[PDB]
Design a protein around this ligand. Structure first.
Ligand SMILES: CN1CCN(Cc2ccc(Cn3ccc4ccc(-c5n[nH]c(N)c5C#N)cc43)cc2)CC1
Ligand SMILES: CN1CCN(Cc2ccc(Cn3ccc4ccc(-c5n[nH]c(N)c5C#N)cc43)cc2)CC1
Lengths: 212, 201
């Protein structure tokens, strides 16, 4: 039973998450995913969510007052507040396992240069807060990271949906002059696992030597 | 100028997307099941090469960069995004199940450039979420649109819930501000990503 709240100035960007949720997991009450438009908590008629950064520099910073109101309404003390950011701790598979058992996740999606730091600092005095990054590249905002995080976490929730894996093959046995490696049709399953382990080692050495 | 074609059995997931166009293609429009059991055994299903071959035949040219998301890929990083930002034609083949038969990539590599990549060390259900991340990271670099973590940012008001913006940022002194931000960045980097500065995780 997990509730996920996403807060964003582009709620439309989260459409694919609602498209990938099975009706049975929802109706069995295993998961609920709500998306909230941040501008619902703005204070002015211009619906301002950003302002110039103290200290100068390019770009804008999301206003603490607007985010404070949104999180105040949506979070409780039991909430896990996830804040995507290019300067976060790495989001990995272990992170996903750990979060997959939470009752309530709130994902605060920023834009521009990100969110006034006091928002997270304030939230952390009464709930668990995690600033994370989904990888070493730069995005426009937190929304794509939210999709990735939701997908990686939810697929580890029952019934919701070391080395690199080597190549896989299926039918037909021959295709455009390429044969499936004969060892896979040998019926020697110890030897098949050895071949796969060695493909796995070579691939890891070639593509991800850092893991070794 | 860039053309991006994404190929998937779940084009419904890609709905979010002048000098750059992005098209989404339903792989199923090339079937006369897309999946079967893996040779050698194992759990799950593998996408058959036949369907993929026909689809990519029609969409790709020798100039095309074929991008294949996979948990076993080379790391997709900011350097990759820079590299790809000057391509004319990207084709992103999104798999599902346990992935795509290896021969699809091996075949395509005889005719064009192929890049198997991963967007991070976690597991997804398919390549669609990766495609969105790759598209976003690359397109924001397309012409006409160091190795440290950015420190904290603040805006108005200068005091909020009894929390003050660090006084140096209000000081208006650029050299003190640049020094403070430098220190902030390096301390964040060593705390959150020591690997970027060459230490153990
Ligand atoms: C270090 N350098 C130099 C300074 N820049 C400053 C900067 C700051 C924000 C933005 C855009 N943005 C706004 C909210 C937000 C959330 C997550 C992400 C995100 N990007 N990449 C990931 N793995 C992300 C995740 N998760 C990006 C976001 C772009 C550029 C940062 C990089
Ligand atoms: C250790 N091994 C043991 C076996 N499994 C095998 C396996 C293989 C595919 C899938 C799902 N899937 C299908 C197509 C496809 C493309 C990209 C991604 C993807 N995941 N994480 C990234 N950074 C991705 C990217 N980019 C996942 C995909 C799930 C599980 C994996 C872990």
């Amino acid at each position: 039973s997990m509730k996920i709240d996403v807060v964003t100035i582009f709620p439309e960007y989260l459409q694919p998450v609602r498209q990938s949720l099975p009706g049975k997991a929802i109706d069995a009450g295993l998961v609920d995913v709500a998306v909230h438009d941040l501008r619902r908590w703005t204070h002015d008629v211009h619906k301002s969510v950003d302002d110039s950064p103290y200290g100068g520099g390019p770009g804008m910073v999301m206003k603490p007052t607007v985010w404070g109101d949104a999180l105040d309404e949506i979070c409780t003390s039991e909430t896990l507040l996830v804040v995507p950011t290019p300067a976060g701790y790495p989001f990995t598979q272990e992170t996903a396992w750990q979060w997959s058992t939470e009752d309530h996740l709130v994902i605060a999606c920023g834009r521009y240069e990100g969110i006034d730091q006091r928002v997270a600092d304030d939230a952390a005095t009464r709930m668990r807060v995690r600033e994370v990054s989904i990888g070493d590249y730069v995005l426009n905002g937190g929304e794509a990271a939210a999709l990735v995080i939701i997908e990686a976490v939810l697929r580890l929730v029952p019934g919701v949906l070391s080395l690199l894996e080597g190549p896989s093959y299926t039918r037909p046995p021959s295709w455009r002059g390429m044969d499936v490696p004969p060892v896979l049709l040998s019926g020697d399953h110890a030897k098949i696992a050895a071949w796969r382990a060695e493909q796995s080692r070579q691939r890891t050495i070639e593509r991800r030597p850092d893991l070794l």
